[PDB]
Amino acid sequence: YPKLYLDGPFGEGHQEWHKFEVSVLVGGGIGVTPFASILKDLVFKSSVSCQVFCKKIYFIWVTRTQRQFEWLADIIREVEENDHQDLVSVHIYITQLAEKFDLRTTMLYICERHFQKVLNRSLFTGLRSITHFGRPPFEPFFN
Amino acid sequence: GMEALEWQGHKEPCRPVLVYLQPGQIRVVDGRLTVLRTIQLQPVNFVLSRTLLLKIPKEYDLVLLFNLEEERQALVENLRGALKESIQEWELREQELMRAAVTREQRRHLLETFFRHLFSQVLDINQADAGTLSQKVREALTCELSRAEFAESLGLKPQDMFVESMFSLADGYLSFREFLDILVVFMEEKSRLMFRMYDFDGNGLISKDEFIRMLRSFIEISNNCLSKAQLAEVVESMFWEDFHFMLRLLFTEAH
Amino acid sequence: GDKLVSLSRKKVEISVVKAELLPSGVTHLRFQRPQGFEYKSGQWVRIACLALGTTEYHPFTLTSAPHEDTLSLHIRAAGPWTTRLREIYSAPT
Ligand SMILES: Cc1cc2nc3c(=O)[nH]c(=O)nc-3n(C[C@H](O)[C@H](O)[C@H](O)COP(=O)(O)OP(=O)(O)OC[C@H]3O[C@@H](n4cnc5c(N)ncnc54)[C@H](O)[C@@H]3O)c2cc1C
Numbered sequence: 001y002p003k004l005y006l007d008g009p010f011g012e013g014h015q016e017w018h019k020f021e022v023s024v025l026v027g028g029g030i031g032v033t034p035f036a037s038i039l040k041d042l043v044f045k046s047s048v049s050c051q052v053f054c055k056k057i058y059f060i061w062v063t064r065t066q067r068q069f070e071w072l073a074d075i076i077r078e079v080e081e082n083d084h085q086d087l088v089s090v091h092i093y094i095t096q097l098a099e100k101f102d103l104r105t106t107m108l109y110i111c112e113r114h115f116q117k118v119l120n121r122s123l124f125t126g127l128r129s130i131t132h133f134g135r136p137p138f139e140p141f142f143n
Numbered sequence: 144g145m146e147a148l149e150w151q152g153h154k155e156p157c158r159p160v161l162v163y164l165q166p167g168q169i170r171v172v173d174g175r176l177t178v179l180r181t182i183q184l185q186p187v188n189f190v191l192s193r194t195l196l197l198k199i200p201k202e203y204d205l206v207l208l209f210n211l212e213e214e215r216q217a218l219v220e221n222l223r224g225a226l227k228e229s230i231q232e233w234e235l236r237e238q239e240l241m242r243a244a245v246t247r248e249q250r251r252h253l254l255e256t257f258f259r260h261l262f263s264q265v266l267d268i269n270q271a272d273a274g275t276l277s278q279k280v281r282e283a284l285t286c287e288l289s290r291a292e293f294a295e296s297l298g299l300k301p302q303d304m305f306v307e308s309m310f311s312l313a314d315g316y317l318s319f320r321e322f323l324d325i326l327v328v329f330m331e332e333k334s335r336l337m338f339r340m341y342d343f344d345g346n347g348l349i350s351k352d353e354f355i356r357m358l359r360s361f362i363e364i365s366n367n368c369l370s371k372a373q374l375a376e377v378v379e380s381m382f383w384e385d386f387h388f389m390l391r392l393l394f395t396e397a398h
Numbered sequence: 399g400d401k402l403v404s405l406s407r408k409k410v411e412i413s414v415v416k417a418e419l420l421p422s423g424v425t426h427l428r429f430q431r432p433q434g435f436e437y438k439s440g441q442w443v444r445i446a447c448l449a450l451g452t453t454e455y456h457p458f459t460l461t462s463a464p465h466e467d468t469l470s471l472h473i474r475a476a477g478p479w480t481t482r483l484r485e486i487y488s489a490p491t
């Protein structure tokens with residue numbers, strides 16, 4: 001492989017969710033690439049530390065289609081696989097109209113609601129987290 | 144072999160490749176001595192337009208570009224000699240050739256709407272979702288795909304548990320017909336879904352061989368050893384309506 | 399703009415755990431850490447003491463390690479504010 005030139009982090013990484021016992025991380029479209037890191041980091045903390053202030057983290061992924069973001073499905077798979085303290089509950093919301101579904105969306109929908117699970121993991125993705133189709137119900141979720 | 148260009152659909156750029164014409168197999172390779180395709184002929188049709196589109200019988204259509212129209216004639220003559228040594232030719236418009244033969248974008252755009260038409264009853268979406276405007280749909284469902292290509296079509300990696308498990312249930316390649324045939328049987332309404340899946344024309348009558356094909360698919364649902372003879376005996380003793388014959392706290396709820 | 403930014407920051411209100419009258423006129427103040435208080439080594443904070451009724455904020459380097467549950471400041475009696483803080487924290491209650 002070729003060699004790369006790296007210019008170090010510019011993030012200035014605010015992490016105020018550690019300041020709250022319960023946090024709701026909402027990711028939308030392209031604005032969900034960082035959360036992978038975040039999620040992994042969080043679970044790693046919950047693995048090594050014991051008296052953490054954030055007792056429960058909710059990750060509301062909202063996307064039209066998971067195209068170009070299928071890797072995030074495997075990242076979430078590993079995140080929930082290593083979450084031994086049930087710190088993170090993930091909720092995926094596909095907002096694509098059913099009339100415009102691609103192959104992946106149709107397969108995910110049927111494996112979610114018209115094809116039986118195996119161990120509460122969808123046969124297509126493999127996630128205990130439930131995928132929902134439509135606009136996320138934010139204020140009923142908050143109540 | 145000789146250097147030329149290969150098309151990859153309306154939205155993709157052409158690739159400069161090389162063509163080697165062996166009798167048993169014609170090999171299109173990359174410029175880095177990397178083989179891209181090796182099509183073997185079993186004793187297919189060709190269309191000319193600068194462009195030469197060979198329509199594989201059960202594989203992806205292959206469109207090659209020529210340096211010149213006379214160069215197109217020379218390359219076509221060489222390829223025809225090599226292929227006939229181990230035979231239908233036609234001519235159509237360039238746009239007609241591009242939008243007629245199976246391309247990747249066109250195949251995906253057809254398969255998505257075909258799947259939506261199939262599973263409209265489950266998705267609770269009206270059948271007016273899109274237009275599947277038959278024979279080309281049958282060809283698209285017939286095309287068997289390698290594991291990597293199929294996983295790419297479904298947006299998965301070649302070594303994912305879902306694709307590997309369905310390949311194990313389907314077994315070297317896989318066609319979408321067998322894929323969804325396994326899927327629907329593993330999904331009473333299954334009989335209606337399978338019947339409407341084999342009703343390409345939409346008239347509602349599986350004429351002669353689609354009934355036996357559906358019987359064989361439902362046998363592929365149920366693992367057995369005497370499959371063919373048992374299915375034949377069942378069909379003989381028995382003979383849609385064919386379905387009847389065969390049967391004889393957190394709040395997360397999206398709008 | 400600087401005053402508006404200073405207003406924008408939310409000044410936490412905290413309580414002291416222990417006060418020591420260290421020799422050479424030093425005050426060791428160990429006080430309760432706010433819940434989401436994350437800092438690195440060598441960082442400094444600002445403090446105010448309303449027991450003086452002055453609302454002055456003065457800077458002091460955090461002498462406690464980040465792994466500690468509390469925050470420590472070693473304030474030198476250099477002038478009026480520091481001496482007044484020392485004498486007011488000299489007595490208990
Ligand atoms: C980053 C930083 C960290 C510090 N950490 C410590 C510490 O850990 N322990 C400690 O004892 N002292 C520390 N100081 C010194 C700090 O200035 C004290 O708060 C100061 O001695 C308080 O003096 P006073 O107001 O009581 O007396 P004054 O007579 O008002 O102060 C006299 C001296 O204090 C300085 N001073 C007063 N107010 C301020 C202010 N708001 N900002 C900057 N300088 C001021 C003046 O320059 C003057 O030279 C630190 C200063 C800085 C800038």
Ligand SMILES: NC(=O)C1=CN([C@@H]2O[C@H](COP(=O)(O)OP(=O)(O)OC[C@H]3O[C@@H](n4cnc5c(N)ncnc54)[C@H](OP(=O)(O)O)[C@@H]3O)[C@@H](O)[C@H]2O)C=CC1
Nearest residue numbers: 027028029030031032062063064065093094095096097135
């Ligand atoms: N932090 C930030 O500032 C971020 C900004 N952006 C900006 O957003 C723009 C578009 O993002 P893109 O990558 O296309 O994301 P997408 O539109 O592809 O996906 C975002 C998801 O949110 C839903 N959504 C989008 N807009 C609205 C809205 N107004 N009201 C309710 N739901 C909505 C969409 O559902 P549906 O389309 O089905 O309604 C979609 O599922 C980009 O130009 C980018 O600059 C993106 C990410 C982070």
